[PDB]
């Protein structure tokens, strides 16, 4: 079911097996590097491996999660095959520790043997302006749509301004629950007869 869907929840506990398989997973984890943080073992234990058979994972990382993200990636069954760099600018297309940071990284991992993806259409650098807190650039949805047109995809730790057609968004700052896919509405009922 095409239009946006979402589940306000605690991702640590939601039985994600009801959701079925996705062509693309994207995740902006609250790495422990406070608020709604997961620990490294809580991250490690996320049941990512059930969300995909063949497809791609897009995993935002910073600081020491550049290493821990790689660990989770491989633990979850993925090989990192690309790494997208979001160069951050401010309005005037000007670039907004030991070095000041001009960028955020998004590891790209692959599981299985995906077929019918349009690889090599976009390049691995996003240039966009910074917006609200942990709000990743919307260009990413366009990149992933061109890479896997039409398919079902899932975003972890998203906010209301992240809901998108063909996406199921999970996160605890969403507003309630809103599922349209028949298959996933069924399973959600059998697994949670009372919400």
């Amino acid at each position: 079911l095409f239009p946006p869907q979402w589940i306000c929840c605690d991702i640590r506990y939601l039985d994600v097996s009801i959701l079925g398989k996705f062509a693309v997973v994207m995740a902006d984890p609250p790495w422990d590097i406070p608020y709604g943080t997961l620990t490294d073992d809580e991250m490690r234990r996320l049941n990512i491996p059930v969300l995909q058979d063949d497809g791609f994972l897009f995993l935002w990382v910073t600081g020491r999660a550049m290493e821990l993200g790689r660990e989770c990636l491989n633990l979850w069954g993925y090989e990192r095959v690309d790494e997208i760099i979001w160069v951050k600018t401010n309005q005037l297309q000007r670039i907004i520790h030991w070095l000041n940071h001009g960028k955020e990284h998004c590891l790209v991992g692959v599981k299985g043997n995906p077929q019918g993806f349009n690889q090599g259409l976009d390049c691995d650098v996003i240039v966009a302006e910074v917006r609200s807190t942990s709000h990743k650039p919307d260009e990413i949805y366009g990149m992933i749509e061109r890479l896997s047109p039409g398919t079902r995809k899932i975003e972890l730790f998203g906010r209301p301004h992240n809901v998108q057609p063909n996406w199921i968004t999970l996160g605890n700052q969403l507003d309630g629950i809103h599922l349209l896919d028949p298959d996933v509405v069924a399973r959600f009922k059998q697994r949670y007869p009372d919400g």
Binding site: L99, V125, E139
Partner: protein, 243 residues
């Protein structure tokens, strides 16, 4: 405006449209004053006992020639990870490793850890294509690869620069890395024993010892080199006035 869509429409990479690529310090004169003379040594590093490079280095810049660069000897991550880097690094020292844009982003981190470093920065060389708005994609690649990474590691116990370098994609077959990495490195004021492995005649630079198989000439002498850091010049930051 969506710059990723534009790249799909026109072939102009999104970084083509970054501009600016007040207040003055120009301390670089401090660096240049304390700089040792350039020393350089032709050596086949695969067959070279790196332990003959003394003393121990405060900064190592490692630029192994990766196969992905060519699309007279390419080095695999197998070869690189077996370099005995930890035997020449000072107990407190820094490494800058060019990792390319493929498997090296993972295997370079393995190397850093193997040799005793923790990664503290990830410097991205972003390559614009203003001069001709797509190469043979590596089979695993999902996207077109328009950048390279240089990993900064630290072992042992103010910011001027950003972790980006933006230059135009060099001609095919030109493997040179942006000279700007030297400026970032020297701006840290880290220590004056600075080694560039796999440097070339064209990268020789004051304040650095350059070792590589393609150097046409050598002037390296261990005792001469050691002399530049003998007392009272020992723990100089390289950003201080002369004693």
């Amino acid at each position: 405006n969506d710059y990723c869509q534009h790249f799909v429409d026109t072939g102009h990479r999104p970084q083509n449209f970054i501009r600016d690529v007040e207040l003055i310090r120009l301390k670089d004169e401090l660096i240049a004053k304390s700089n040792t003379p350039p020393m350089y040594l032709q050596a086949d590093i695969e067959a070279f006992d790196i332990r003959e490079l003394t003393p121990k280095f405060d900064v190592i810049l490692l630029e192994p020639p990766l196969e992905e660069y060519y699309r007279e000897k390419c080095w695999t991550w197998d070869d690189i990870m077996k370099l005995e880097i930890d035997e020449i690094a000072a107990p407190r020292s820094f490494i800058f490793l060019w990792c390319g844009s493929g498997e090296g982003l993972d295997l370079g981190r393995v190397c850093l850890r193997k040799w005793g470093y923790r990664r503290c920065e990830d410097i991205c060389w972003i390559k614009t294509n203003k001069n001709n708005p797509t190469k043979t994609l590596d089979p695993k690649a999902v996207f077109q690869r328009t950048k390279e990474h240089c990993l900064m590691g630290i072992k042992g116990t103010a910011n001027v620069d950003i972790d980006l370098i933006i230059t135009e994609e060099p001609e095919i077959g030109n493997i040179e890395k942006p000279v700007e990495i030297f400026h970032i490195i020297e701006h840290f004021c880290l220590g004056r024993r600075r080694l560039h492995l796999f440097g070339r005649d064209s990268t020789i630079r004051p304040g650095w010892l350059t070792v590589g198989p393609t150097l046409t000439n050598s002037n390296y002498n261990a005792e001469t080199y050691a002399s530049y850091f003998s007392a009272p010049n020992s723990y100089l930051t390289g950003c201080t006035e002369e004693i």
